[PDB]
Amino acid sequence: MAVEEVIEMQGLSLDPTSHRVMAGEEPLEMGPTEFKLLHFFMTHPERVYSREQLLNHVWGTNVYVEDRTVDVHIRRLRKALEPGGHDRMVQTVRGTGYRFSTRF
DNA sequence: ACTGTCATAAATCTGT
DNA sequence: ACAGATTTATGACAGT
C-alpha cells in the first residue's frame, strides 16, 4: 500500500500522516524541522550520522546553513522529548555526529 | 510563531 | 594533574 503507517517503538509513537508524536499515548509537541529529523532518526535506529548527512537528508542537498544549525535543532528535539522521557535515545558521537538508539 | 547565528560553559584528547 | 586546542551543550536574539 501507499498510505502512510505509524511507527511505534519503546513507548514512543509517531504518525507521519497526522504529524503526531505521542509518548505512552500522551502527545508531545514540536515544529516541522524537528518532526522531520525525528522521522529520519526513528526510520534509522542504530546508525551514526554526521551533521553533513543530517543536512542532506533533513534540511536538503541544495539548502545552505552552518553545521551548528544541527546542534541547536538537536537541543530543540531533546527539549521536546524530555518531558516525554525519550530525550536519552538521541545520543552524541564526539568528533563525528549523532546516533539514535532504543536503549544502548 | 519557526528557523538560523553568536556567546559563553562544559567536555574530550594529547603532551609534559 | 593542568593547560592548550577542538567539539558539543545551552541561552538569548535576529530575520523572515
UniProtKB/Swiss-Prot annotation:
DNA-binding region range list: 4-102
Coiled-coil regions listed: none
Post-translational modifications: Phosphorylated by PhoR or CreC.
Domain of life: Bacteria
Subcellular location: Cytoplasm
Chain's role: This protein is a positive regulator for the phosphate regulon. Transcription of this operon is positively regulated by PhoB and PhoR when phosphate is limited.
Protein name: Phosphate regulon transcriptional regulatory protein PhoB
Species the sequence originates in: Escherichia coli (strain K12)
Lineage: Bacteria, Pseudomonadati, Pseudomonadota, Gammaproteobacteria, Enterobacterales
Interval of the full protein contained in this chain: 126 to 229 of 229
